[PDB]
Amino acid sequence: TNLCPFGEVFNATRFASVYAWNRKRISNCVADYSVLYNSASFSTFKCYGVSPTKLNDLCFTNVYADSFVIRGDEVRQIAPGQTGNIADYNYKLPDDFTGCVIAWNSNNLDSKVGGNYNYLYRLFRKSNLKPFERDISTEIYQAGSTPCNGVKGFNCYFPLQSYGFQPTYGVGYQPYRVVVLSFELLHAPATVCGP
Amino acid sequence: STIEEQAKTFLDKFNHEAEDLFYQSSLASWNYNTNITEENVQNMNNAGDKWSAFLKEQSTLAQMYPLQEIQNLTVKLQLQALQQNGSSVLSEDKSKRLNTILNTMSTIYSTGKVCNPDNPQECLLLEPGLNEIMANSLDYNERLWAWESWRSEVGKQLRPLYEEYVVLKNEMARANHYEDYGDYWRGDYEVNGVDGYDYSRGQLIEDVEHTFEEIKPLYEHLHAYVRAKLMNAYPSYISPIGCLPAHLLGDMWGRFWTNLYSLTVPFGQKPNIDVTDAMVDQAWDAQRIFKEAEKFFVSVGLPNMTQGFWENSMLTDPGNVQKAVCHPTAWDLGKGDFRILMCTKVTMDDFLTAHHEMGHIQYDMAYAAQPFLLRNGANEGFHEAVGEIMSLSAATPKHLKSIGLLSPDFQEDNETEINFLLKQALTIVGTLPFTYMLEKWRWMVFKGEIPKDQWMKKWWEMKREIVGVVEPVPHDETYCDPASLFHVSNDYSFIRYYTRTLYQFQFQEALCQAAKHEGPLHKCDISNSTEAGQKLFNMLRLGKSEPWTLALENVVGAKNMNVRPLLNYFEPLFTWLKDQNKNSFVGWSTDWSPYA
Ligand SMILES: *[C@@H]1O[C@H](CO)[C@@H](O[C@@H]2O[C@H](CO)[C@@H](O)[C@H](O)[C@H]2NC(C)=O)[C@H](O)[C@H]1NC(C)=O
Ligand SMILES: *[C@@H]1O[C@H](CO)[C@@H](O)[C@H](O)[C@H]1NC(C)=O
Ligand SMILES: *[C@@H]1O[C@H](CO)[C@@H](O)[C@H](O)[C@H]1NC(C)=O
Ligand SMILES: *[C@@H]1O[C@H](CO)[C@@H](O)[C@H](O)[C@H]1NC(C)=O
Ligand SMILES: *[C@@H]1O[C@H](CO)[C@@H](O)[C@H](O)[C@H]1NC(C)=O
Ligand SMILES: *[C@@H]1O[C@H](CO)[C@@H](O)[C@H](O)[C@H]1NC(C)=O
Ligand SMILES: [Zn+2]
C-alpha cells in the first residue's frame, strides 16, 4: 500500500516557471485519483481520452506530473491543438494527449503587491515546441539579420518575459497553478494501478 | 525577415513591457490620488518618470522601422502612434524652453490670485473664489470685477508666454510635417488607406463649419430668449439687439450657460425632478448607487463589474485624516484592473455621475483585448460621448420610476419638459458656439492668419459675430483672454467638446431606435434593451483598431458627424423658443458694447 506522492506536486511551496516546467515521474504506488476530481478545489479539471469519473480502476506503466504557473487567460492553452505563447513556446500537449489538466487560482500565493517577478515565460522562439519538449535556453533572440553578440539591442531581445503577478490583477491576469497528468501505456510492467 | 515582421516582433516586446511599466505608474498614481502623502507624490513621480523614459526610448526604436514598408494596417497604426511626435523633433534647448513655458503657464493659472481693492490680503483664486462669484452672484459690478481682474492680472502674465508657446509649437509641428500646430491637433481625426472610410485633417474644418451652420438657428433663438430674460433682470445694462455682456453668462468665460437657469427658467412654479430626498428616505449609500448603475448596464447585455472593481475602487470619501482627490475618474490600470475613484454623496447628481463613469469603465473593459496602443476611444470625442448617454437614460422620469426613486403618481406635463430641455440647452447648446469659436481662433493663430498685434481685436470680433457675446471692457493686445481658460493655457485641444456633443446624440438616437423607443428622443431609456447594448458593444470593443468613421457607422449607420440627432433632441424646445421670440428681436448687432 504505497501511496503515490501527489502532495509533493500539488502542495509544493513554489511552482516552476512554465518555460522551465517541472516533471515528476510517479511509479510503484497506489493513486487515489478520485480524491482529486471529487475535492472541489480546482477551477479546471479536464481529462482527455481517460475519464475522471472513477477510472482509478485502471493500471498504467508510468504517470508523469507536469506542474507550472501561468496566467488565468492562458490556461485554455494547456489542451490538445492549441496555439499561443504558452502552447507554442513553453509547454505543448500532443494532439492525441491521454491525461488530465488540473488548474486552480493561486493569487493568494504567487501574487505580491509591487509585483512578483519569480515566474517567467518564453516570448520568442525560432520555431514551435514539439509535444512535451522543454526549452530553458537564454540565447538572445535575433529578430533581424545582425548578430546580437549575446546582449540585448536593436532587433535583439531577451527571449524570456516575466508575469509580474500583482494581487490587484484581474482574474485573467492572476496566477494559476497547473498540474498535467500524463498516463503512459507501454508493453511493460504497468506499475501504477491505484484502486 | 522583412521589415514588417521585425515591426511585429518589436511591437510584441513593447506591449508586454509597456503593460508592466504602465501598471506600476497607474498603481502609484492611484495610491496618491486616494491617499495624499509626500511619500506617495515621490513614488508617483518615480514610477511616472520610468514610464515616460520607457516611452521616449521605445519611440526612438520605433522610428527605425519606416512606415513605408508596412502593409498590415493594424501594425502601422500601432507603429505610427508610438512614432508619436518622436522623442522631441526639436533640439534639446527648444524642447526645454517649451516645457518651462508650459509649466509656467500652468502655474500662473492654478496659482493666479486676485485681490479686492483696499485690502491686499483678502485675495481670491479662480477656484473656488472667482468661480463662486461668476456662478452665483447677481450683482453686475461684482461679476464685472471678477471677470476683468482675472484677465487683467493673470491673462496679461500669459500673453508673452503664449506668444512664444505658439512659435515653438508650430516649429515642432512643421518639423513633424504638419502645416502648423492646429493641423497637428486635427490629425486625431485623420484616416488613411481604408477605402470608403478615409478622412483628411482639413475635412474636419469643413464638417465642423457645415454642421455649425445648422446649429445657428437653434442657438439664435436660445440667444434671443436668454437676452430677453436677462434684459428684464438688468434693464439698464442690456440692449434688446446687442450681444450678451461676457460677464453675465454663469461662469468665468460663458463656456456654459448652465447657471443662467434661475433667471431664464420658463415655468418657475414647476420644480425640478430631484430624487435626492427619495434616495435619503430609502437609506441609499454609495454602494447602492453603483449597484444600480451596474444593473443598468447588465440590463442591456453588458457584463457586470469585476470582483476587483468592488474590492479596489474608492466609492466613498476616505475619512477625516487620509485625504484624496475627489474629482470623479474612471481608471483603466491594465492587467484587468478597473476602478472608479469618486467621493460619492447620496444625491441625484452623483447617481448620474456614477452612470457616466461606469460608462467609461464599460468602454475600457470592451477593448481590453485590443493591443495596448489601440486601447482608447475611436477618436478624442468617443469616450465622453459614451459616458454622457448613460446619464441621459438614467435621468429620465421613465427610468427613475422603474427603480423606485420617482413615485408612479408623478406625471410629467409639457411645461416640465420645456424646463428640462431649456436647462439642457443652456449647457449643451450654449457651449457649441463658444467651443467652435475658441478653436477657430486657435486654428487661425497657428495658421498665421491672425497677426500678433490683432490677437485680442480678432478674439472679440469673433466673440461678437459667432457667439453673440461682447466684452464689457475694451482689451488691447496686452491681454490674452483666451489663455484665461484652463484648456488654452494648459495646452489642450478644444474641438473635442464640439464633436463629442454631436456624437452623443447620434449614439442615443441610434440606441433608442434599436430599443424601439416611442415619442420624443429626450424621454428615451435604453434600459432592458439588449439590442441597444449589442449595437453599442460592437463599437466599444473596437477601441482604436478601426477608423472612427467605421466605428461610428457601427452604431448609427453613417460614416460622418451629423447634427440632425442633436436638433431632433431639442426640437420641442426649438418650437417653443420660436413662439416665445415672436415679440423679440432674433439675432444680434455686433457694434453695441456696454462701454459705449
Ligand atoms: C496583421 O497582423 C496580425 C498579427 O500580426 C494578424 O492577426 C493574426 O492572424 C493569425 C491568423 O492569420 C492569428 O493566428 C493570430 O492570432 C492573429 N494575431 C493577432 C495579434 O491578431 C492580422 O491578420 C494581420 N492583418 C492583415 C490584414 O494581414
Ligand atoms: C494538500 O494539502 C491539503 C491540506 O493538507 C490536503 O487536503 C490535500 O490532499 C493535499 N494535496 C494532495 C495532492 O494530497
Ligand atoms: C497612506 O499612505 C501611507 C504612506 O504614505 C501608508 O503608510 C498608509 O498605510 C496609507 N493609508 C491608507 C489608508 O492607505
Ligand atoms: C458577474 O456575473 C457572472 C455571471 O455571468 C457571475 O458568475 C459573477 O459572480 C458576477 N460577479 C459580480 C461581481 O456580480
Ligand atoms: C426592466 O425589466 C424589468 C423586468 O425584467 C421591469 O420590472 C422593469 O420595469 C423594466 N424597466 C425598464 C426601464 O424598462
Ligand atoms: C401644453 O399643452 C397644452 C394643451 O395642448 C397647450 O395649450 C400648451 O400650450 C402646451 N404648453 C407648451 C407647448 O409649452
Ligand atoms: Zn467622463
PDB file of N, CA, C and O in Angstrom, chain A residues 74-117:
ATOM      1  N   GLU A  74      -4.411  32.079 -19.986  1.00  0.00           N
ATOM      2  CA  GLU A  74      -3.576  31.146 -20.731  1.00  0.00           C
ATOM      3  C   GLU A  74      -3.819  29.691 -20.353  1.00  0.00           C
ATOM      4  O   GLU A  74      -3.199  28.803 -20.944  1.00  0.00           O
ATOM      5  N   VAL A  75      -4.705  29.426 -19.388  1.00  0.00           N
ATOM      6  CA  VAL A  75      -4.999  28.048 -19.002  1.00  0.00           C
ATOM      7  C   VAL A  75      -5.641  27.294 -20.159  1.00  0.00           C
ATOM      8  O   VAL A  75      -5.411  26.091 -20.332  1.00  0.00           O
ATOM      9  N   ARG A  76      -6.434  27.987 -20.980  1.00  0.00           N
ATOM     10  CA  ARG A  76      -7.065  27.351 -22.131  1.00  0.00           C
ATOM     11  C   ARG A  76      -6.047  26.842 -23.145  1.00  0.00           C
ATOM     12  O   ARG A  76      -6.393  26.005 -23.986  1.00  0.00           O
ATOM     13  N   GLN A  77      -4.803  27.323 -23.088  1.00  0.00           N
ATOM     14  CA  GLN A  77      -3.767  26.848 -23.993  1.00  0.00           C
ATOM     15  C   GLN A  77      -3.195  25.495 -23.589  1.00  0.00           C
ATOM     16  O   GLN A  77      -2.503  24.868 -24.400  1.00  0.00           O
ATOM     17  N   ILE A  78      -3.461  25.031 -22.372  1.00  0.00           N
ATOM     18  CA  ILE A  78      -2.991  23.707 -21.934  1.00  0.00           C
ATOM     19  C   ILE A  78      -4.079  22.723 -22.344  1.00  0.00           C
ATOM     20  O   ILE A  78      -4.934  22.308 -21.558  1.00  0.00           O
ATOM     21  N   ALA A  79      -4.032  22.323 -23.614  1.00  0.00           N
ATOM     22  CA  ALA A  79      -5.024  21.453 -24.230  1.00  0.00           C
ATOM     23  C   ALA A  79      -4.523  21.029 -25.605  1.00  0.00           C
ATOM     24  O   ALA A  79      -3.709  21.740 -26.209  1.00  0.00           O
ATOM     25  N   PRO A  80      -4.963  19.883 -26.124  1.00  0.00           N
ATOM     26  CA  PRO A  80      -4.510  19.461 -27.455  1.00  0.00           C
ATOM     27  C   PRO A  80      -4.915  20.457 -28.532  1.00  0.00           C
ATOM     28  O   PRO A  80      -6.015  21.015 -28.511  1.00  0.00           O
ATOM     29  N   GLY A  81      -4.008  20.674 -29.480  1.00  0.00           N
ATOM     30  CA  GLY A  81      -4.300  21.508 -30.636  1.00  0.00           C
ATOM     31  C   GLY A  81      -4.609  22.957 -30.324  1.00  0.00           C
ATOM     32  O   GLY A  81      -5.562  23.517 -30.881  1.00  0.00           O
ATOM     33  N   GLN A  82      -3.826  23.580 -29.448  1.00  0.00           N
ATOM     34  CA  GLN A  82      -4.000  24.983 -29.107  1.00  0.00           C
ATOM     35  C   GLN A  82      -2.773  25.778 -29.532  1.00  0.00           C
ATOM     36  O   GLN A  82      -1.660  25.246 -29.601  1.00  0.00           O
ATOM     37  N   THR A  83      -2.986  27.059 -29.821  1.00  0.00           N
ATOM     38  CA  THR A  83      -1.921  27.965 -30.217  1.00  0.00           C
ATOM     39  C   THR A  83      -1.829  29.122 -29.229  1.00  0.00           C
ATOM     40  O   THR A  83      -2.753  29.386 -28.455  1.00  0.00           O
ATOM     41  N   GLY A  84      -0.688  29.806 -29.261  1.00  0.00           N
ATOM     42  CA  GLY A  84      -0.431  30.900 -28.344  1.00  0.00           C
ATOM     43  C   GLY A  84       0.985  30.875 -27.809  1.00  0.00           C
ATOM     44  O   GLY A  84       1.756  29.967 -28.132  1.00  0.00           O
ATOM     45  N   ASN A  85       1.341  31.863 -26.983  1.00  0.00           N
ATOM     46  CA  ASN A  85       2.709  31.948 -26.481  1.00  0.00           C
ATOM     47  C   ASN A  85       3.070  30.735 -25.632  1.00  0.00           C
ATOM     48  O   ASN A  85       4.193  30.224 -25.714  1.00  0.00           O
ATOM     49  N   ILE A  86       2.136  30.263 -24.805  1.00  0.00           N
ATOM     50  CA  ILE A  86       2.424  29.136 -23.923  1.00  0.00           C
ATOM     51  C   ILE A  86       2.491  27.837 -24.714  1.00  0.00           C
ATOM     52  O   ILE A  86       3.447  27.061 -24.586  1.00  0.00           O
ATOM     53  N   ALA A  87       1.477  27.579 -25.544  1.00  0.00           N
ATOM     54  CA  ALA A  87       1.414  26.309 -26.258  1.00  0.00           C
ATOM     55  C   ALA A  87       2.565  26.168 -27.244  1.00  0.00           C
ATOM     56  O   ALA A  87       3.127  25.078 -27.399  1.00  0.00           O
ATOM     57  N   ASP A  88       2.946  27.259 -27.904  1.00  0.00           N
ATOM     58  CA  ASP A  88       3.956  27.191 -28.951  1.00  0.00           C
ATOM     59  C   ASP A  88       5.381  27.274 -28.421  1.00  0.00           C
ATOM     60  O   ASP A  88       6.281  26.661 -29.005  1.00  0.00           O
ATOM     61  N   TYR A  89       5.617  28.014 -27.335  1.00  0.00           N
ATOM     62  CA  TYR A  89       6.974  28.302 -26.891  1.00  0.00           C
ATOM     63  C   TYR A  89       7.328  27.757 -25.514  1.00  0.00           C
ATOM     64  O   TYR A  89       8.520  27.681 -25.198  1.00  0.00           O
ATOM     65  N   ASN A  90       6.350  27.389 -24.687  1.00  0.00           N
ATOM     66  CA  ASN A  90       6.631  26.995 -23.310  1.00  0.00           C
ATOM     67  C   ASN A  90       6.253  25.554 -23.006  1.00  0.00           C
ATOM     68  O   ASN A  90       7.092  24.792 -22.511  1.00  0.00           O
ATOM     69  N   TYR A  91       5.014  25.154 -23.283  1.00  0.00           N
ATOM     70  CA  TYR A  91       4.546  23.814 -22.937  1.00  0.00           C
ATOM     71  C   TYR A  91       3.498  23.389 -23.952  1.00  0.00           C
ATOM     72  O   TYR A  91       2.446  24.028 -24.060  1.00  0.00           O
ATOM     73  N   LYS A  92       3.779  22.314 -24.686  1.00  0.00           N
ATOM     74  CA  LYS A  92       2.922  21.843 -25.767  1.00  0.00           C
ATOM     75  C   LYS A  92       2.404  20.449 -25.449  1.00  0.00           C
ATOM     76  O   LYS A  92       3.185  19.553 -25.112  1.00  0.00           O
ATOM     77  N   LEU A  93       1.089  20.268 -25.567  1.00  0.00           N
ATOM     78  CA  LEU A  93       0.452  18.967 -25.434  1.00  0.00           C
ATOM     79  C   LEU A  93       0.196  18.359 -26.808  1.00  0.00           C
ATOM     80  O   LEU A  93      -0.138  19.083 -27.754  1.00  0.00           O
ATOM     81  N   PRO A  94       0.343  17.045 -26.951  1.00  0.00           N
ATOM     82  CA  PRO A  94       0.139  16.418 -28.260  1.00  0.00           C
ATOM     83  C   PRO A  94      -1.332  16.368 -28.641  1.00  0.00           C
ATOM     84  O   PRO A  94      -2.231  16.538 -27.815  1.00  0.00           O
ATOM     85  N   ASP A  95      -1.565  16.134 -29.936  1.00  0.00           N
ATOM     86  CA  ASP A  95      -2.931  16.043 -30.443  1.00  0.00           C
ATOM     87  C   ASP A  95      -3.665  14.844 -29.853  1.00  0.00           C
ATOM     88  O   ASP A  95      -4.868  14.919 -29.579  1.00  0.00           O
ATOM     89  N   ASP A  96      -2.960  13.733 -29.650  1.00  0.00           N
ATOM     90  CA  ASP A  96      -3.538  12.510 -29.096  1.00  0.00           C
ATOM     91  C   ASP A  96      -3.269  12.387 -27.602  1.00  0.00           C
ATOM     92  O   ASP A  96      -3.047  11.287 -27.088  1.00  0.00           O
ATOM     93  N   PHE A  97      -3.276  13.513 -26.892  1.00  0.00           N
ATOM     94  CA  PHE A  97      -2.963  13.518 -25.469  1.00  0.00           C
ATOM     95  C   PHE A  97      -3.970  12.685 -24.687  1.00  0.00           C
ATOM     96  O   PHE A  97      -5.183  12.834 -24.854  1.00  0.00           O
ATOM     97  N   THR A  98      -3.458  11.805 -23.830  1.00  0.00           N
ATOM     98  CA  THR A  98      -4.277  10.987 -22.938  1.00  0.00           C
ATOM     99  C   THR A  98      -3.884  11.323 -21.500  1.00  0.00           C
ATOM    100  O   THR A  98      -2.827  10.906 -21.016  1.00  0.00           O
ATOM    101  N   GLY A  99      -4.735  12.085 -20.826  1.00  0.00           N
ATOM    102  CA  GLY A  99      -4.446  12.505 -19.471  1.00  0.00           C
ATOM    103  C   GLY A  99      -5.392  13.609 -19.046  1.00  0.00           C
ATOM    104  O   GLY A  99      -6.415  13.859 -19.688  1.00  0.00           O
ATOM    105  N   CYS A 100      -5.022  14.275 -17.954  1.00  0.00           N
ATOM    106  CA  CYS A 100      -5.858  15.302 -17.352  1.00  0.00           C
ATOM    107  C   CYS A 100      -5.058  16.579 -17.138  1.00  0.00           C
ATOM    108  O   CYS A 100      -3.851  16.542 -16.884  1.00  0.00           O
ATOM    109  N   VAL A 101      -5.749  17.710 -17.248  1.00  0.00           N
ATOM    110  CA  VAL A 101      -5.183  19.027 -16.976  1.00  0.00           C
ATOM    111  C   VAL A 101      -5.921  19.606 -15.778  1.00  0.00           C
ATOM    112  O   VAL A 101      -7.153  19.717 -15.795  1.00  0.00           O
ATOM    113  N   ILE A 102      -5.172  19.974 -14.742  1.00  0.00           N
ATOM    114  CA  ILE A 102      -5.731  20.457 -13.485  1.00  0.00           C
ATOM    115  C   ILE A 102      -5.136  21.825 -13.190  1.00  0.00           C
ATOM    116  O   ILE A 102      -3.914  22.003 -13.261  1.00  0.00           O
ATOM    117  N   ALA A 103      -5.995  22.790 -12.861  1.00  0.00           N
ATOM    118  CA  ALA A 103      -5.543  24.143 -12.577  1.00  0.00           C
ATOM    119  C   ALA A 103      -6.405  24.752 -11.481  1.00  0.00           C
ATOM    120  O   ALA A 103      -7.569  24.380 -11.307  1.00  0.00           O
ATOM    121  N   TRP A 104      -5.818  25.694 -10.744  1.00  0.00           N
ATOM    122  CA  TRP A 104      -6.542  26.429  -9.717  1.00  0.00           C
ATOM    123  C   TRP A 104      -5.892  27.792  -9.528  1.00  0.00           C
ATOM    124  O   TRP A 104      -4.699  27.971  -9.789  1.00  0.00           O
ATOM    125  N   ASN A 105      -6.694  28.752  -9.073  1.00  0.00           N
ATOM    126  CA  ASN A 105      -6.206  30.106  -8.852  1.00  0.00           C
ATOM    127  C   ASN A 105      -5.246  30.137  -7.666  1.00  0.00           C
ATOM    128  O   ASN A 105      -5.541  29.590  -6.599  1.00  0.00           O
ATOM    129  N   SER A 106      -4.094  30.780  -7.856  1.00  0.00           N
ATOM    130  CA  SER A 106      -3.077  30.897  -6.819  1.00  0.00           C
ATOM    131  C   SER A 106      -2.720  32.354  -6.543  1.00  0.00           C
ATOM    132  O   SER A 106      -1.566  32.674  -6.252  1.00  0.00           O
ATOM    133  N   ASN A 107      -3.708  33.248  -6.636  1.00  0.00           N
ATOM    134  CA  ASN A 107      -3.459  34.661  -6.364  1.00  0.00           C
ATOM    135  C   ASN A 107      -3.010  34.884  -4.926  1.00  0.00           C
ATOM    136  O   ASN A 107      -2.279  35.839  -4.645  1.00  0.00           O
ATOM    137  N   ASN A 108      -3.436  34.017  -4.005  1.00  0.00           N
ATOM    138  CA  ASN A 108      -3.069  34.172  -2.602  1.00  0.00           C
ATOM    139  C   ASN A 108      -1.626  33.775  -2.325  1.00  0.00           C
ATOM    140  O   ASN A 108      -1.074  34.177  -1.295  1.00  0.00           O
ATOM    141  N   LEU A 109      -1.002  33.001  -3.211  1.00  0.00           N
ATOM    142  CA  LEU A 109       0.359  32.517  -3.009  1.00  0.00           C
ATOM    143  C   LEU A 109       1.380  33.152  -3.939  1.00  0.00           C
ATOM    144  O   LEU A 109       2.472  33.509  -3.492  1.00  0.00           O
ATOM    145  N   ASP A 110       1.057  33.303  -5.222  1.00  0.00           N
ATOM    146  CA  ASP A 110       2.026  33.713  -6.228  1.00  0.00           C
ATOM    147  C   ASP A 110       1.929  35.190  -6.593  1.00  0.00           C
ATOM    148  O   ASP A 110       2.624  35.634  -7.511  1.00  0.00           O
ATOM    149  N   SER A 111       1.090  35.957  -5.905  1.00  0.00           N
ATOM    150  CA  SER A 111       0.976  37.388  -6.140  1.00  0.00           C
ATOM    151  C   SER A 111       1.553  38.161  -4.961  1.00  0.00           C
ATOM    152  O   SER A 111       1.563  37.682  -3.823  1.00  0.00           O
ATOM    153  N   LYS A 112       2.036  39.365  -5.251  1.00  0.00           N
ATOM    154  CA  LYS A 112       2.636  40.224  -4.240  1.00  0.00           C
ATOM    155  C   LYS A 112       2.460  41.670  -4.672  1.00  0.00           C
ATOM    156  O   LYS A 112       2.735  42.007  -5.828  1.00  0.00           O
ATOM    157  N   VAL A 113       1.986  42.516  -3.753  1.00  0.00           N
ATOM    158  CA  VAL A 113       1.814  43.927  -4.073  1.00  0.00           C
ATOM    159  C   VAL A 113       3.176  44.520  -4.397  1.00  0.00           C
ATOM    160  O   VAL A 113       4.148  44.346  -3.650  1.00  0.00           O
ATOM    161  N   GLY A 114       3.271  45.074  -5.598  1.00  0.00           N
ATOM    162  CA  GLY A 114       4.540  45.605  -6.109  1.00  0.00           C
ATOM    163  C   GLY A 114       5.015  44.729  -7.243  1.00  0.00           C
ATOM    164  O   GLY A 114       5.822  45.183  -8.034  1.00  0.00           O
ATOM    165  N   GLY A 115       4.530  43.490  -7.291  1.00  0.00           N
ATOM    166  CA  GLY A 115       4.886  42.588  -8.369  1.00  0.00           C
ATOM    167  C   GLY A 115       5.759  41.421  -7.956  1.00  0.00           C
ATOM    168  O   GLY A 115       6.782  41.605  -7.288  1.00  0.00           O
ATOM    169  N   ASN A 116       5.366  40.210  -8.352  1.00  0.00           N
ATOM    170  CA  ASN A 116       6.150  39.001  -8.123  1.00  0.00           C
ATOM    171  C   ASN A 116       6.765  38.590  -9.455  1.00  0.00           C
ATOM    172  O   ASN A 116       6.067  38.067 -10.331  1.00  0.00           O
ATOM    173  N   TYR A 117       8.070  38.819  -9.582  1.00  0.00           N
ATOM    174  CA  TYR A 117       8.830  38.574 -10.833  1.00  0.00           C
ATOM    175  C   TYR A 117       9.574  37.243 -10.792  1.00  0.00           C
ATOM    176  O   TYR A 117      10.589  37.132 -11.455  1.00  0.00           O
TER     177      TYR A 117
END
